[PDB]
């Protein structure tokens, strides 16, 4: 009776110790991966800013071409009273683009399995 309980508790303790060591190693590996991402971040941020600005500029050029005949339209008019920079919506960038990349941008991460 005592022997069975002792064997069970010993197995539990051995498993706990092994899992402790392995989980600490996993924590260290996760920190290493996060540090790699942190090191790589600024280049991605710069590229994202450049891409967003280019998309906005192309949309502005197309708006200037199209809205030429509308009487009261002001090309590139902000809808906010403030002059602070405002992050554009998905529709502000992909409004005039083809439909497949619209779907990719709006739904790719959710639909990727």
């Amino acid at each position: 009776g005592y022997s069975m309980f002792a064997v069970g508790i010993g197995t539990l303790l051995f498993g706990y110790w092994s899992m402790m060591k392995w989980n600490r190693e996993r924590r260290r590996l996760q920190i290493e991966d996060f540090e790699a991402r942190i090191a790589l971040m600024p280049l991605f941020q710069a590229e994202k800013d450049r891409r967003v600005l280019q998309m906005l500029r192309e949309n502005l050029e197309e708006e200037a071409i199209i809205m030429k005949d509308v009487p009261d339209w002001k090309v590139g008019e902000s809808v906010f009273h403030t002059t602070r920079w405002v992050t554009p919506m998905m529709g502000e960038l992909y409004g005039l683009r083809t439909n497949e990349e619209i779907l990719s941008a709006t739904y790719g991460f959710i639909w990727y399995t």
């Binding site: 590996l29 971040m41 280049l43 800013d49 450049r50 600005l53 500029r57 590139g76 602070r84």
Partner: protein
């Protein structure tokens, strides 16, 4: 109310870094250690200005610095780096744990050369 100002497409032209994500991850640590100053300047400017249009020069600087770093790597340690990033690329999660051996070879090579 007002007109938004956007930089011309000639202001957004820069030599892009045309390497894939696995290649970037392979040399992420050395890139962070060596190219730290332009990256930190750009990121501080980004967090202080709160405006993408006020930080174009720092973006061009960080692109140029990354290109210089990769040119040095290509000049000196092309082959060990190629093996290392190939191994990193094969895995689905791109784990550093898979091939510590190639990483050790690349680290010792780049410590010997540069």
């Amino acid at each position: 109310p007002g007109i938004v100002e956007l930089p011309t497409l000639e202001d957004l032209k820069v030599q892009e870094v045309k390497v894939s994500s696995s290649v970037l991850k392979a040399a992420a640590h050395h890139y962070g250690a060596q190219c730290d100053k332009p990256n930190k300047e750009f990121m501080l400017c980004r967090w202080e200005e709160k405006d993408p249009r006020r930080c174009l020069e720092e973006g061009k600087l960080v692109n140029q610095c990354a290109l210089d770093f990769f040119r040095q790597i290509k000049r000196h340690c092309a082959e060990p780096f190629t093996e290392y990033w190939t191994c990193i690329d094969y895995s689905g999660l791109q784990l550093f744990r898979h091939c510590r051996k190639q990483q050790a070879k690349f680290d010792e090579c780049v410590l010997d050369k540069l």
